[PDB]
Symmetry: C2
Subunit: 333 residues, 2 copies
């Protein structure tokens, strides 16, 4: 208990006990930007939940901060560039969480293609009048088998989706800021430029982090490039021009849209709500599963301790930080 760690959320008791074995902890549940500004200087590291934002204004007071462990799969609540400039290591949680998200995504894909979510409503309404009504009445349904799937973002989650899709007989295409050749041949995924992928893919999956460079990466023009195709989003609503997506749906241009995320959450009303056949919509819970929720805490604690032990964690988001402040400089344990 020598490094001073601030836990900014309600973590599982067990994960906390593990952390306390190595550091002194201060529990400051979901602090406002002002409250965190006045206490952040006390910590060598912090464990934060998505709801807490680590802005450049917060970092200005992080005099001894060495590591920020995001207890989530995403890290858009962190000003990455500013953290990097200050030599602050930022980590995120993969493990069972990444697996759970990737599993959920494939479920979104199969529902968007095969319409199971729609059929479930259908039968419960008593509409199953006959074999003919279904096998003739149901609009054309395409299978995932034999389709070309293009994935944008090949991080922990993107790779997990790719591995799950192979046995479904799809052809994989992908794009990522940092290209992964060591993954390409393994999963038989052909690297391509964004637009080339949008044009050549039958199905497009969004597994990108939300940054200034990915905001509306799927703009109105690109939505047009997706006429007759399927779009699946598990990153953030802002990865797409949601108004443009919706319009494409209502006009019958975009064949289908499945998403677990929206530009403005929570969503209580939406034009896409009436399009039950063309869309699959979930209330942002792709990472919600018992096993995953139990693992996140341990992983977040492990990621933070690794850095303070002078070890580079595999889930380090801003690897460039290594050049700014060599890991030896932040080793406390």
């Amino acid at each position: 208990m020598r490094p001073k760690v601030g836990v900014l959320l309600k973590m599982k008791r067990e994960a906390l006990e593990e952390l306390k074995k190595y550091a002194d902890v201060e529990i400051i549940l979901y602090p406002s930007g002002e409250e965190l500004k006045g206490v952040i200087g006390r910590f060598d590291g912090i464990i934060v939940s998505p709801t807490t934002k680590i802005t450049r204004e917060v970092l200005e007071n992080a005099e001894r901060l060495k590591v920020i462990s995001c207890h989530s799969a995403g890290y858009d609540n962190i000003d990455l560039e500013e953290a990097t400039k200050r030599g602050i290591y930022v980590t995120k949680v993969s493990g069972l969480l990444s697996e759970a998200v990737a599993e959920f995504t494939v479920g979104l894909i199969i529902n968007l293609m095969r319409k199971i979510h729609y059929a479930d409503k259908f039968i419960r309404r008593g509409e199953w009048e006959s074999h003919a009504k279904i096998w003739t009445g149901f609009k054309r349904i395409e299978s995932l088998y034999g389709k070309k799937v293009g994935i944008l973002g090949m991080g922990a989650i993107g790779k997990a989706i790719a591995r799950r899709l192979i046995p479904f007989g799809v052809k994989l295409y992908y794009w990522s800021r940092h290209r992964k050749v060591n993954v390409e041949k393994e999963l038989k995924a052909r690297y391509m430029d964004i637009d080339e992928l949008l044009e050549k893919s039958d199905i497009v999956i969004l597994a990108l982090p939300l940054t200034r460079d990915t905001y509306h990466i799927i703009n109105e023009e690109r939505v047009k490039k997706l006429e007759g195709k399927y779009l699946v989003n598990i990153g953030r609503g802002a990865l797409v021009d949601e108004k443009a997506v919706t319009e494409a749906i209502k006009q019958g241009k975009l064949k289908g849209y499945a998403t677990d995320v929206f530009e403005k959450e929570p969503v209580r009303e939406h034009e896409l709500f009436k399009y039950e056949w063309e869309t699959v919509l979930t209330p942002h819970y792709a990472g919600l599963a018992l096993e995953a929720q139990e693992d996140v805490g341990f992983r977040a604690v492990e990621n933070l301790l690794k850095v303070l032990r002078g070890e580079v964690p595999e889930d380090l988001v801003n690897k460039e930080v290594l050049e700014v402040r060599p890991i030896e400089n932040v080793k406390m344990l």
Copy 2:
């Protein structure tokens, strides 16, 4: 244009044209037993769907019948014992259909576990009040990852399902009327007796043909063995004692049940309709997909023509027939 073929279901024009190249065709849509036995004498072969029952009554007048091609995955609608006795070859369809059903099955599994179908309804009903509402509203969700999945039936569909589940991180157990040593090491699936599988599995999947022996394979007593577990059915409703399954669901014992088939189809009313969270129900359309169905028609036509050309189709269902009437004896093409 030598053999005469009776097409007893609605087939796509392309498949029919293919068939007309080699045989004179007569279309008799979904005939009753009395209607069919009255005309069955004119055909060298017939193409049929699950709704047409080929019985001893019908086969009595089947003087020139040499092959029965089922335009489907299942063949429980055919009396194999009588067909075999009369030296009639019975075939089913494999290929893209099997792939489409396996894909569908995984969709049912992910929905049954992760509740996407329920959440889709939930959000469209405008109940997404907040993040807390969701994450607290339902955390008992379990991921497919790390689970023990027991598959009953390891034929084309069973294998296709198993191959798909591997990357999801499951442990596979299975039972089959005919053990498959090669699949066991290939897919690392552990062979088990039926009751042992039901006891050790977290999730049980039914991909067995319905026969007198597999009738109610999941009976009342076995349902009790599933307390706290998940059951998925994509074969035929009669594979389970549906009433017993329904009770186990209402009594909160069986954790979840998803099925694309029921003992009495079509189903316009059912006790399970109110159990939106605990079940996933689809109107028997697991094999319904464009690419797959176009393949089914050509496959059914080709399985029939192969027999008449004196070739043993790999999809031959009743192999015993070879001892009654060798393939050379039915060669007409």
